[PDB]
Amino acid sequence: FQDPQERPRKLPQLCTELQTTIHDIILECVYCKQQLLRREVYDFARRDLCIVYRDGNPYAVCDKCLKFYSKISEYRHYSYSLYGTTLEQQYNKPLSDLLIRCINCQKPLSPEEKQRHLDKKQRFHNIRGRWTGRCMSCSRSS
Amino acid sequence: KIEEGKLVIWINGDKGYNGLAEVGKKFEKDTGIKVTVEHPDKLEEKFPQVAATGDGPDIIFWAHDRFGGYAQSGLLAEITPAAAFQDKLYPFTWDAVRYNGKLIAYPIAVEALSLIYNKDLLPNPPKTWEEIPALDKELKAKGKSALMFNLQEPYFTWPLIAADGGYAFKYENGKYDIKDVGVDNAGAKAGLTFLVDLIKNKHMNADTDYSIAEAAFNKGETAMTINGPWAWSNIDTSAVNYGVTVLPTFKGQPSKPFVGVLSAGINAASPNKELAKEFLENYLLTDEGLEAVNKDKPLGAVALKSYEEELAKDPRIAATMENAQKGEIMPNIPQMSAFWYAVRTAVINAASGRQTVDAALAAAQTNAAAELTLQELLGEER
Numbered sequence: 001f002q003d004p005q006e007r008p009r010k011l012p013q014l015c016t017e018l019q020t021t022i023h024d025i026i027l028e029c030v031y032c033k034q035q036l037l038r039r040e041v042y043d044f045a046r047r048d049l050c051i052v053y054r055d056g057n058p059y060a061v062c063d064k065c066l067k068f069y070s071k072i073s074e075y076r077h078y079s080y081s082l083y084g085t086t087l088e089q090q091y092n093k094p095l096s097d098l099l100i101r102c103i104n105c106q107k108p109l110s111p112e113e114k115q116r117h118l119d120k121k122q123r124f125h126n127i128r129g130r131w132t133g134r135c136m137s138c139s140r141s142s
Numbered sequence: 143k144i145e146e147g148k149l150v151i152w153i154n155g156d157k158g159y160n161g162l163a164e165v166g167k168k169f170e171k172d173t174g175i176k177v178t179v180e181h182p183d184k185l186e187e188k189f190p191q192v193a194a195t196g197d198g199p200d201i202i203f204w205a206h207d208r209f210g211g212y213a214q215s216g217l218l219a220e221i222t223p224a225a226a227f228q229d230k231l232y233p234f235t236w237d238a239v240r241y242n243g244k245l246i247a248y249p250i251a252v253e254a255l256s257l258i259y260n261k262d263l264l265p266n267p268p269k270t271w272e273e274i275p276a277l278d279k280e281l282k283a284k285g286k287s288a289l290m291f292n293l294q295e296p297y298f299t300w301p302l303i304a305a306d307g308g309y310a311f312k313y314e315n316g317k318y319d320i321k322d323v324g325v326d327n328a329g330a331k332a333g334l335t336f337l338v339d340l341i342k343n344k345h346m347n348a349d350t351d352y353s354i355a356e357a358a359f360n361k362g363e364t365a366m367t368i369n370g371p372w373a374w375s376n377i378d379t380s381a382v383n384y385g386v387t388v389l390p391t392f393k394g395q396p397s398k399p400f401v402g403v404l405s406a407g408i409n410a411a412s413p414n415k416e417l418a419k420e421f422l423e424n425y426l427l428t429d430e431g432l433e434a435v436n437k438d439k440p441l442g443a444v445a446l447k448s449y450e451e452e453l454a455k456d457p458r459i460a461a462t463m464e465n466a467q468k469g470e471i472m473p474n475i476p477q478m479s480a481f482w483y484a485v486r487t488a489v490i491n492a493a494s495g496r497q498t499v500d501a502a503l504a505a506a507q508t509n510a511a512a513e514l515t516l517q518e519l520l521g522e523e524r
């Protein structure tokens with residue numbers, strides 16, 4: 001996997017290339033190098049994350065390492081916050097048309113999660129150009 | 143929405159509350175176009191926030207390192223100077239404002255940290271870092287200290303850390319290699335060990351920041367400080383008989399400070415891009431324009447060849463240039479934010495004595511690389 005203009009970018013294309021399924025693929029975390037649990041493989045795909053190549057090998061990320069680094073990033077690279085309505089007015093699009101990832105797990109927020117923010121009067125955070133919120137699972141426990 | 147037929151400029155207040163405004167007044171007299179100079183708080187942070195919505199100033203003045211990140215976010219207009227205009231400014235200043243093969247700002251002035259010394263306490267400043275502990279023992283007996291400078295910002299501690307071999311990102315084949323960080327190496331370890339030993343031997347204090355160092359030097363309590371041209375004006379007011387010189391050597395090698403280029407970027411959302419190029423090229427970047435700004439607050443070593451030659455006779459500007467030539471241009475790549483925070487933490491952790499220098503630097507290279515890996519996991523989509 002030499003050039004990035006060829007090698008599979010996301011998990012579904014990687015499965016296709018190896019001629020395997022998401023139920024069978026063996027992946028390791030880019031950080032800790034521990035093999036991902038089957039549930040973590042599914043979460044990597046749900047989070048719409050990119051496969052990261054190191055020394056010509058594909059790597060994913062485990063749940064614990066992703067949350068660890070996502071927290072350090074928010075801490076250091078937080079820019080500013082807006083209420084959902086102000087964000088909609090800024091880009092002249094409903095929240096459903098914007099890419100808002102969970103600040104903790106990176107999962108792109110569902111329309112229901114974006115609506116919870118509006119109802120609960122919870123702000124969205126800008127992390128150096130990236131808009132973030134909080135998913136249902138991370139709203140329970142991060 | 144930015145207002146058409148007018149120019150709004152953002153510059154830091156310590157670059158002059160009169161100088162640039164005066165150039166703006168000459169532009170208004172000639173064109174009829176109103177020029178408004180503003181000094182917002184945290185303008186380098188306010189700019190990427192407002193400009194992302196198609197708002198903000200027409201022109202932004204800041205150090206070049208932040209410009210790569212603004213250009214990556216599509217916030218800056220590509221600048222189009224003709225060959226004859228490009229010729230009036232030094233090539234390395236144009237290199238500092240080049241992002242992904244395009245010019246993204248106009249270079250104004252070149253800055254680097256220098257060794258600032260009190261001529262009354264210290265007529266001959268030390269040429270080496272290694273002689274500073276012996277100098278401190280002599281001065282402590284007189285109720286003074288040898289050196290006091292900001293230890294909080296990695297920009298200030300870098301001259302010494304980089305001296306024997308440290309670097310931010312490797313530059314080869316006209317490109318920065320984001321995987322080649324030079325924090326965890328023998329050079330950076332030697333420099334930081336010397337810095338931390340100064341703190342351990344009580345020649346410096348880990349809590350020393352900008353304000354503490356400035357007050358100490360300007361009150362004649364410390365024989366030396368490390369600062370840039372933005373600090374000279376307060377030293378002038380203090381009436382301290384000061385000298386600005388070459389930074390001390392470490393292990394026989396010169397201190398490698400970062401080199402900053404004050405730059406003027408045109409907002410990509412501005413409807414006044416032609417007015418902006420006109421003002422920057424034909425009003426500001428002239429001997430007359432830079433003199434109006436410089437007489438208010440010194441810029442350092444100007445990018446404009448003609449005026450730099452005229453100012454070079456100031457020994458403080460000659461020291462700024464000598465240090466900049468021995469220095470390292472700050473990379474303008476957005477990946478620099480990963481570097482800055484990792485190094486900042488390393489210095490704090492090592493200086494506290496809660497971790498060894500080597501372990502702190504190893505953690506800094508791991509941490510900077512980890513932030514960049516996270517960005518790669520997320521992708522460029524926003």
Ligand SMILES: OC[C@H]1O[C@H](O[C@H]2[C@H](O)[C@@H](O)[C@@H](O[C@H]3[C@H](O)[C@@H](O)[C@@H](O[C@H]4[C@H](O)[C@@H](O)[C@@H](O[C@H]5[C@H](O)[C@@H](O)[C@@H](O[C@H]6[C@H](O)[C@@H](O)[C@@H](O)O[C@@H]6CO)O[C@@H]5CO)O[C@@H]4CO)O[C@@H]3CO)O[C@@H]2CO)[C@H](O)[C@@H](O)[C@@H]1O
Pocket residue numbers: 154156157205207208253294295296297298352370372402479482483486
């Ligand atoms: O409240 C908690 C916390 O806050 C304080 O510091 C934090 C700070 O407010 C925050 O903005 C951030 O800073 C980051 C930064 O965003 C990064 O971009 C990076 O900064 C580097 C910078 O981009 C470089 O250009 C370079 O800056 C140089 C300049 O190039 C020089 O011109 C010179 O600036 C002078 C300037 O010209 C004048 O106009 C005048 O205004 O004063 C300036 C001098 O003070 O010097 C600076 C260097 O200081 O180098 C920068 C790197 O050092 O990296 C920053 C992080 O280190 O993060 C801070 C921490 O979270 C506060 O200080 C803390 O004690 C506190 O913990």
Ligand SMILES: [Zn+2]
Pocket residue numbers: 029030031032033034061062063064065066
């Ligand atoms: Zn892991």
Ligand SMILES: [Zn+2]
Pocket residue numbers: 102103104105106107134135136137138
């Ligand atoms: Zn989440």
